[PDB]
A paper describes a structure:
WDR5 adopts a donut-shaped propeller structure, containing a WDR5 interaction (WIN) motif that binds MLL1, and another cleft known as the WDR5 binding motif (WBM) site that mediates protein-protein interactions (PPIs) with a diverse set of non-MLL partners such as c-MYC. PROTACs simultaneously bind the protein of interest (POI) and an E3 ligase such as von Hippel–Lindau (VHL) or cereblon (CRBN) and hijack the cellular ubiquitination-proteasome system, leading to selective polyubiquitination and subsequent degradation of the POI at the proteasome. Here, we present pharmacological degradation of WDR5 as a promising therapeutic strategy for treating WDR5-dependent tumors and report two high-resolution crystal structures of WDR5-degrader-E3 ligase ternary complexes.
The ternary complex of WDR5-MS33-VCB crystallizes in space group P21 with one molecule in the crystallographic asymmetric unit. The electron density for MS33 is well defined and bridges WDR5 and VHL. One key difference was that, whereas the electron density for most of the morpholine ring of OICR-9429 was missing in the OICR-9429-WDR5 binary complex, suggestive of multiple conformations, electron density for the structurally equivalent piperazine ring in MS33 was ordered, wherein the ring protruded out of the WIN cavity and connected to the linker. Overall, the linker in MS33 was relatively extended and resulted in a sparse protein-protein interface between VHL and WDR5. The most prominent of protein-protein contacts involved Arg69 of VHL, in one of its two conformations, making hydrogen bonds and electrostatic interactions with the side chain of Asp172 and the main chain carbonyl atoms of Tyr191, Asp192, and Asn214 of WDR5, as well as electrostatic interactions between Asp92 of VHL and Lys259 of WDR5. Many water molecules permeated the VHL-WDR5 interface, with several molecules mediating contacts between VHL and WDR5. Because of the relatively large separation between VHL and WDR5, there were almost no “cross” protein-ligand interactions. That is, VHL interacted exclusively with the VHL-1 portion of MS33 and WDR5 interacted exclusively with the OICR-9429 portion. We observed an enhancement in VCB binding to a preformed WDR5-MS33 binary complex (α = Kd(binary)/Kd(ternary) = 1.66), reflecting that the VHL and WDR5 interface was stabilized by a few positive interactions.
Residue numbers in the entry:
A (entry chain L): 58 to 205
B (entry chain B): 32 to 334
C (entry chain K): 17 to 47, 57 to 112
D (entry chain J): 1 to 103
Write the structure that this text describes.
Amino acid sequence: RPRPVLRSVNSREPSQVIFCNRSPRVVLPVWLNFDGEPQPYPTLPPGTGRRIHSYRGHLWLFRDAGTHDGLLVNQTELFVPSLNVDGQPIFANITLPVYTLKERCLQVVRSLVKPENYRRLDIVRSLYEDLEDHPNVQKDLERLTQER
Amino acid sequence: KPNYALKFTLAGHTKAVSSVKFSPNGEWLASSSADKLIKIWGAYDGKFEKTISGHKLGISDVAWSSDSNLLVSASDDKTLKIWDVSSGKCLKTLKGHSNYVFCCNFNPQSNLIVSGSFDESVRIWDVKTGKCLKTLPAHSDPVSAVHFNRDGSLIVSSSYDGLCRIWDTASGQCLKTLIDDDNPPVSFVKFSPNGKYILAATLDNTLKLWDYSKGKCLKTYTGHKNEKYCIFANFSVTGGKWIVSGSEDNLVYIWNLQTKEIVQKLQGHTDVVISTACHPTENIIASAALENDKTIKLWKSDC
Amino acid sequence: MYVKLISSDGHEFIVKREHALTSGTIKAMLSTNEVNFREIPSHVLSKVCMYFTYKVRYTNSSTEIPEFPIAPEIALELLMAANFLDC
Amino acid sequence: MDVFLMIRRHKTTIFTDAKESSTVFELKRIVEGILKRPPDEQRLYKDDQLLDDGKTLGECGFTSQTARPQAPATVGLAFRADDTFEALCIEPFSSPPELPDVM
Ligand SMILES: Cc1ncsc1-c1ccc(CNC(=O)[C@@H]2C[C@@H](O)CN2C(=O)[C@@H](NC(=O)CCCCCCCCCC(=O)NCCN2CCN(Cc3cccc(-c4ccc(N5CCN(C)CC5)c(NC(=O)C5=C(C(F)(F)F)CC(=O)N=C5)c4)c3)CC2)C(C)(C)C)cc1
Ligand code: NA
């Protein structure tokens, strides 16, 4: 069975959005083009927000810009602008997920250890593999596809 | 049906070739390229004549004055340049656009230049002084093509906003817009030689021939591939009456204007054929291709 | 209701049952309301309990969520514990 | 304004939450539910300072900013039976090993 390509619908209907970075990370906005390919956009420092122009039915994801850890937007993975009403921008509130303790530990250990050095750590092999399985937008694309 | 065959390949440029234009006197072919250069070639034998340099970034388009003495170039460096072809001198640098200049054309009198830019404006320039006379910003996305009509009283522009706009040259006011049921980006537009129609390309693999007096689409040409690049199309009227266009499958497509049937596909280029030109008096087509190719080809036909 | 989680060095950590059941391992070990860990030491288990509180407080809360801080000196053992506890 | 706490005595640590407006006495009632000693047999401390039963947690220094779910503030606990008062005594946690070379 053909699996749906998560992609922006090319509606050519403008939508103004506030990208609100309510996280402590440097945020990389990621726009899925009409072919479903991720495109990185300019980054947002923690504690900042920007008014930006997008379009109805376009698809956005948000990651840590340095580590590509996945982030949430309006409490979910994907942000899709709709039509503005009454001249009001659409807020895209970008926040930290509540990571599992294990994933948060992996994040910190990865931030401390060069990948080449992971297997010097005195831990079991499955934790090596966990450390080596870096965050990846494509993982979320695959999961959100298998959910639809 | 015509029988265009390859005669010459001109391999002078070191990057994508953006535009080829025959001089109105039929003697020369001008080519512009992402390598920041204009080159002049013999129209009939493809013999290199000269290199014209001055732009600081790649060149998107060139156009000849009616007397074949002047060229105008449109550049990524946000300027146009007016050149004396015999000397290779930059006569004027037209400044005013605030982003890449993609397209340019003289009017038939050749006292005006029209330009179109990523900055979403169409500009009208005085050839004598180089001053910008009017800025027309109604388009809401990059302008892909600009062309004057037979007496210079109209300008037609095409834009990624999906519109063709017909402008009154004297006042600057937009006299008409042209659009079908859908709004794909319009990648190319030009008035027919005869003046009655407008040929417009859209990034849905489609060329359309419009009666712009009646706002009616008369013909539609497909079979080629055109979804990404702004490909220049042409009327061929020296023999039979054909529509000519490049294609993203590296071919030159030739259609019968009335039947809309593909009558030829010219193979040889190894990248997107972004530009085609038709010789003013003889059955000669020039074509030019992007970065994997970098060459110009000249093709000739008995009809 | 509360449960008592006992570290390898004998520290007792009394936490709400709902917080402890964040870990399917702890749930399996509860099946007394006390769990004795044979290897996880107190400095790690106290951090795990703080994670439980943070997780329950901020999960599906629609608010700005702060980072869960982990010092480098504790990170590797905390990783080992989080893996074992599956939390 | 919520505050998140560790109430600590000997080798026992209770994780609980309260409010800046909660009184020390309320905290003792929470403790009583768990350890089964009444508030009049409890003394609560912030560092070496005995806390007055009627002061609110905010008046003692426990704010939402310094008493977070992920970094709770510590309240010390000591018991009392009639005329015998147990001194405040909190056993420290273990210590992490030397940070590995690759970190
Ligand atoms: C703050 C900030 N902080 C955190 S984040 C954030 C933020 C910042 C900014 C924004 C802006 N907002 C968005 O970006 C939104 C966000 C999201 O919602 C999507 N989106 C959009 O705006 C999108 N737009 C829309 O959704 C509605 C309108 C989009 C139009 C539909 C496009 C149809 C698909 C076609 C396609 O796939 N194209 C891809 C490849 N092209 C290649 C050319 N690119 C550049 C370009 C764009 C436009 C025109 C021309 C053009 C046109 C004509 C010519 N020439 C004409 C004359 N010929 C003779 C020659 C060619 C040339 N020129 C050339 O091509 C050229 C050369 C050559 F010809 F050789 F190639 C050589 C050379 O030296 N120089 C130039 C160029 C060229 C564009 C992409 C999009 C713009 C990202 C697409 C948002 C946030
Ligand atoms: Na990280």
